[PDB]
């Protein structure tokens, strides 16, 4: 039905708010420390001197377990 | 449909694995450091002296902004 699809797109846009802001393709799973922004994956934030969000120096990455890591 | 029934579910599991593991009734917004494990809201993670989840030693809570957070 109609509501089948809204909620396939509420899974979709759920699920695509967990994923890498930088490459798109990878969960995030790293934090920029001390501002807090948990935007990034591994690789992606390995490189970052600032951070993309808030522009707040990077001190170091501290690496998150999620539950919804999939 | 069924297919409705089933997309509810796995909504509703996404959603509950958003929320504290502790009260579950607040976002997952905490990190316990240096382990890694975030599972609480801000109130149940200052409320821990050891990681639930791997019994480590908390040093100190790290605040995450995540994109998934809501808000009324
Ligand atoms: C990813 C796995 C394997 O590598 C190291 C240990 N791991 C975890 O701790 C995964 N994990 C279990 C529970 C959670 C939680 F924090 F998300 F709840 N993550
Ligand atoms: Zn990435
Ligand atoms: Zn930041
Ligand atoms: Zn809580
Ligand atoms: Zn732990």
Not at 18 to 25: G, N, P, T, W
Request: charged fraction near 20%.
């Amino acid at each position: 039905s109609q509501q089948t699809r809204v909620l396939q797109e509420k899974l979709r846009k759920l699920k695509e708010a967990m994923l890498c802001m930088v490459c798109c393709e990878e969960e995030i799973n790293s934090t920029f420390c001390p501002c807090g922004h948990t935007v990034c994956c591994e690789s992606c934030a390995a490189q970052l001197q600032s951070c993309p969000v808030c522009r707040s120096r990077v001190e170091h990455v501290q690496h998150v377990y999620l539950p919804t890591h999939t």
